[PDB]
Amino acid sequence: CTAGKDITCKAAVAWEPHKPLSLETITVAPPKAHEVRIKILASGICGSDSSVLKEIIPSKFPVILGHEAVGVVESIGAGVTCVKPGDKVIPLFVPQCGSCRACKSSNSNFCEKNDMGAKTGLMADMTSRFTCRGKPIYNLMGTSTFTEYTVVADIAVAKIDPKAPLESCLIGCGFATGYGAAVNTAKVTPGSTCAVFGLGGVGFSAIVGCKAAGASRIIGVGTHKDKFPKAIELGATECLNPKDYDKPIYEVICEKTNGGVDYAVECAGRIETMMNALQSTYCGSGVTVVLGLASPNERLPLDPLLLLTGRSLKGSVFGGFKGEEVSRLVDDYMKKKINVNFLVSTKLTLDQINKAFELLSSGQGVRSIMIY
Amino acid sequence: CTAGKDITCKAAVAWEPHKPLSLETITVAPPKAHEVRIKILASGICGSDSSVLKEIIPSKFPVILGHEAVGVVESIGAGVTCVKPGDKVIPLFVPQCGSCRACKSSNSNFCEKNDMGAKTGLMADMTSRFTCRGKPIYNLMGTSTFTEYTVVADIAVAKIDPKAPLESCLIGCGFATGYGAAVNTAKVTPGSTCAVFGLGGVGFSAIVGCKAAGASRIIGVGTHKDKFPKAIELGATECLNPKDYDKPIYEVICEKTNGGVDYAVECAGRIETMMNALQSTYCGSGVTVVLGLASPNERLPLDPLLLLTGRSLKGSVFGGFKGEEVSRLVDDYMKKKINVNFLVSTKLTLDQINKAFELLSSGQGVRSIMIY
Ligand SMILES: NC(=O)c1ccc[n+]([C@@H]2O[C@H](COP(=O)([O-])OP(=O)(O)OC[C@H]3O[C@@H](n4cnc5c(N)ncnc54)[C@H](OP(=O)(O)O)[C@@H]3O)[C@@H](O)[C@H]2O)c1
Ligand SMILES: NC(=O)c1ccc[n+]([C@@H]2O[C@H](COP(=O)([O-])OP(=O)(O)OC[C@H]3O[C@@H](n4cnc5c(N)ncnc54)[C@H](OP(=O)(O)O)[C@@H]3O)[C@@H](O)[C@H]2O)c1
Ligand SMILES: [Zn+2]
Ligand SMILES: [Zn+2]
Numbered sequence: 028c029t030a031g032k033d034i035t036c037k038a039a040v041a042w043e044p045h046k047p048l049s050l051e052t053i054t055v056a057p058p059k060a061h062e063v064r065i066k067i068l069a070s071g072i073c074g075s076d077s078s079v080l081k082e083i084i085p086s087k088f089p090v091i092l093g094h095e096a097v098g099v100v101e102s103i104g105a106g107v108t109c110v111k112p113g114d115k116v117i118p119l120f121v122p123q124c125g126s127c128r129a130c131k132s133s134n135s136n137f138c139e140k141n142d143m144g145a146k147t148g149l150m151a152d153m154t155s156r157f158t159c160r161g162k163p164i165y166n167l168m169g170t171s172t173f174t175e176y177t178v179v180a181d182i183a184v185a186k187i188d189p190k191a192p193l194e195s196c197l198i199g200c201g202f203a204t205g206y207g208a209a210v211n212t213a214k215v216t217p218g219s220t221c222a223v224f225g226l227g228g229v230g231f232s233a234i235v236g237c238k239a240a241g242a243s244r245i246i247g248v249g250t251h252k253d254k255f256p257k258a259i260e261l262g263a264t265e266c267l268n269p270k271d272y273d274k275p276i277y278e279v280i281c282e283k284t285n286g287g288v289d290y291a292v293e294c295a296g297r298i299e300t301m302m303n304a305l306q307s308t309y310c311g312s313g314v315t316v317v318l319g320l321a322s323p324n325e326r327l328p329l330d331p332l333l334l335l336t337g338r339s340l341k342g343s344v345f346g347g348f349k350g351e352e353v354s355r356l357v358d359d360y361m362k363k364k365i366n367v368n369f370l371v372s373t374k375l376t377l378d379q380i381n382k383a384f385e386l387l388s389s390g391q392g393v394r395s396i397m398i399y
Numbered sequence: 400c401t402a403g404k405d406i407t408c409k410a411a412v413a414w415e416p417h418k419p420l421s422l423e424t425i426t427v428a429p430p431k432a433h434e435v436r437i438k439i440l441a442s443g444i445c446g447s448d449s450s451v452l453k454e455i456i457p458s459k460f461p462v463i464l465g466h467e468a469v470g471v472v473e474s475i476g477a478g479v480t481c482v483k484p485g486d487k488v489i490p491l492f493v494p495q496c497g498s499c500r501a502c503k504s505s506n507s508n509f510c511e512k513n514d515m516g517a518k519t520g521l522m523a524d525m526t527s528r529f530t531c532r533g534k535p536i537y538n539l540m541g542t543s544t545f546t547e548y549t550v551v552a553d554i555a556v557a558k559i560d561p562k563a564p565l566e567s568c569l570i571g572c573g574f575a576t577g578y579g580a581a582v583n584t585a586k587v588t589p590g591s592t593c594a595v596f597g598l599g600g601v602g603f604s605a606i607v608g609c610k611a612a613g614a615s616r617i618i619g620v621g622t623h624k625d626k627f628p629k630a631i632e633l634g635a636t637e638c639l640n641p642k643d644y645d646k647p648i649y650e651v652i653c654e655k656t657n658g659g660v661d662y663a664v665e666c667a668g669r670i671e672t673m674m675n676a677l678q679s680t681y682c683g684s685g686v687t688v689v690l691g692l693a694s695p696n697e698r699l700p701l702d703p704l705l706l707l708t709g710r711s712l713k714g715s716v717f718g719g720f721k722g723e724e725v726s727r728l729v730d731d732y733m734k735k736k737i738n739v740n741f742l743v744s745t746k747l748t749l750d751q752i753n754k755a756f757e758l759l760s761s762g763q764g765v766r767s768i769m770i771y
């Protein structure tokens with residue numbers, strides 16, 4: 028039994044930015060009050076994890092990344108009632124305290140207890156449960172999944188079906204984000220025309236989302252044509268490679284869609300892709316959703332006239348989903364309403380984690396996950 | 400009888416930008432096929448009219464400005480069936496052809512027959528119905544109301560109650576825009592908190608709109624405290640003057656509204672004001688509507704991160720209203736549901752038109768109108 032005891036396990040540590048993750052032996056302390064220690068079963072590698080390493084997204088170091096996973100509760104701290112040892116769960120990088128303005132609302136999921144703003148990289152009591160070589164290691168958005176065991180607040184966990192597949196880990200971020208961006212944020216309607224920019228994990232999930240919402244046309248826009256067949260299989264009606272064109276991609280799209288698409292979803296994290304997405308929508312009612320994160324000091328040179336005719340520009344985190352909605356997604360996945368496992372193009376071990384980061388730059392595949 | 404004859408009348412002509420409007424005697428030709436000649440009863444002076452004169456909004460010159468009015472049909476061209484001589488009407492600067500993508504969709508009012516993009520300043524057949532000092536004079540957005548008589552396309556006219564008050568002219572633009580920005584574009588919900596930036600004709604209408612939508616708090620934000628009393632009278636729960644604080648106005652608002660308002664409406668046409676409005680909304684679900692038009696080359700330095708948490712930024716013209724909805728607005732006004740006349744702080748004659756433009760730079764009052 029490991030309850031109430033320190034656990035020694037394997038984890039991928041980021042001692043510094045711009046450097047490959049280091050496989051280390053670490054110590055994971057027992058959960059304190061209102062905390063839950065989880066044995067990670069599978070973890071996905073998200074573009075945001077890569078961005079932290081490139082300093083595109085701020086974070087303290089040393090740090091254990093990863094925020095897309097599925098696991099089983101190993102033990103619970105004092106006062107915990109929402110889960111119990113043995114329950115299968117998905118860590119939430121966007122918690123749900125249930126009492127803040129966002130949580131009490133039905134139009135927001137941005138719980139104020141999130142650490143995306145403060146970036147403390149520590150637990151609620153400002154201490155760390157991670158130790159490596161006698162040094163406290165910071166966590167990522169209250170999760171950290173690039174480790175065999177992690178500890179999270181009891182408001183940052185979603186209990187799910189005990190038999191949920193290991194591929195359910197994508198629901199921890201990438202899939203819920205892209206899927207939700209289409210279904211919740213953009214609010215894609217039946218028969219509408221959509222365009223998705225950036226065919227990575229999130230982008231493919233957005234394509235699946237637009238299809239589920241009933242779009243009549245879904246245009247996948249990316250620079251790696253090897254992904255096109257896959258994109259079509261998952262819902263895209265056609266794909267376009269901006270590099271093939273001399274004329275602006277938004278002009279190409281507007282010419283093909285009677286003036287522009289109804290909904291555009293940006294999933295690359297590039298100011299240029301955001302601008303292309305916006306201008307690819309119909310000026311009279313087009314809706315653009317930005318999901319990607321660009322360098323902190325980059326800005327979108329927005330001409331207000333682009334919005335004046337009737338356009339909308341919005342953004343969201345975790346597809347606008349609240350933690351309490353995660354289980355339902357897992358259910359739909361098992362009922363085959365959504366085949367999340369289709370997005371898993373590569374399965375690796377924790378030791379091969381750096382390969383997943385290498386693939387992120389490759390011109391193929393969708394999502395890589397690790398089975399511990 | 401003037402049917403089928405040229406009419407000689409008075410009008411205010413802008414021979415060139417940056418100069419006072421010139422009172423002239425002009426000739427107005429009879430309406431051609433699918434056109435309607437209207438005797439203007441009253442016209443308001445809109446900030447947009449001033450912007451054209453200052454070259455903030457592009458236009459050919461010489462031109463007769465004005466796009467906010469109420470009048471009566473004097474005669475109709477061949478094929479016209481929607482109105483007849485004697486009908487009271489409101490010219491529409493955003494037409495409704497009923498056949499384009501925008502007109503077929505309930506989510507847009509930006510009829511592709513509008514002249515806001517092409518700026519031809521001419522009738523459909525590329526000719527003008529206005530002549531002054533032997534020269535053809537351009538029109539404004541298919542309307543032009545700074546003239547005793549004007550000719551418009553039959554898809555650019557809304558028939559309204561024969562007994563509609565002269566003040567109904569504000570529905571032609573200012574009122575419909577501000578009011579609609581709240582009810583249609585922002586979609587203000589009962590019990591929400593709102594902030595309106597720029598207390599001019601449009602701003603006051605937005606206040607009226609937020610109140611009609613059932614907002615519990617309506618914060619008027621402007622640099623002229625003398626307008627606050629009237630603002631409160633029309634629906635504002637309080638007013639703030641940026642100059643009375645050492646910190647950014649959006650920090651003051653967030654501090655006073657538990658993180659920011661639910662809906663913010665920009666009505667000044669300044670990049671700085673637009674940015675203040677955006678950041679003044681709650682990061683988890685705040686909605687900002689931009690209505691003002693800034694200089695052509697100005698750009699909003701938008702940090703994507705401001706949207707990622709759950710904010711929406713959108714814009715619209717004519718408050719999102721379609722031409723077919725104008726009569727309903729006039730009806731509500733005559734039933735005292737909305738007191739449009741309350742926004743008229745100055746009444747002039749055509750000869751005094753320049754005083755109205757001077758007043759836009761005074762710092763008091765709301766809207767000026769001229770009775771012909
Ligand atoms: N708001 C949220 O909740 C949320 C959640 C997770 C991730 N994100 C962000 O969303 C983005 C997508 O993440 P993934 O989806 O996790 O990432 P990913 O798999 O790395 O995919 C990003 C995709 O965007 C395109 N891309 C990458 N670099 C590019 C460049 N220099 N120029 C043009 N296109 C480029 C590529 O698409 P093609 O191969 O088709 O060109 C690539 O597959 C990341 O920026 C991530 O941080 C946001
Ligand atoms: N999209 C549409 O359908 C539509 C329709 C009509 C007008 N508009 C636009 O809406 C805006 C306002 O029109 P009105 O409402 O017709 O105009 P207006 O009566 O001139 O009022 C504009 C108001 O904005 C503020 N303002 C103006 N110049 C400013 C400056 N340099 N710095 C700070 N605040 C300033 C003032 O408010 P305070 O005194 O409270 O500071 C002023 O009362 C214009 O930009 C116009 O082009 C859009
Ligand atoms: Zn992620
Ligand atoms: Zn909360």
Ligand SMILES: [Zn+2]
Pocket residue numbers: 494495496497498499500501502509510511512
């Ligand atoms: Zn139309």
Ligand SMILES: [Zn+2]
Pocket residue numbers: 445446447448466467572573
């Ligand atoms: Zn106007």
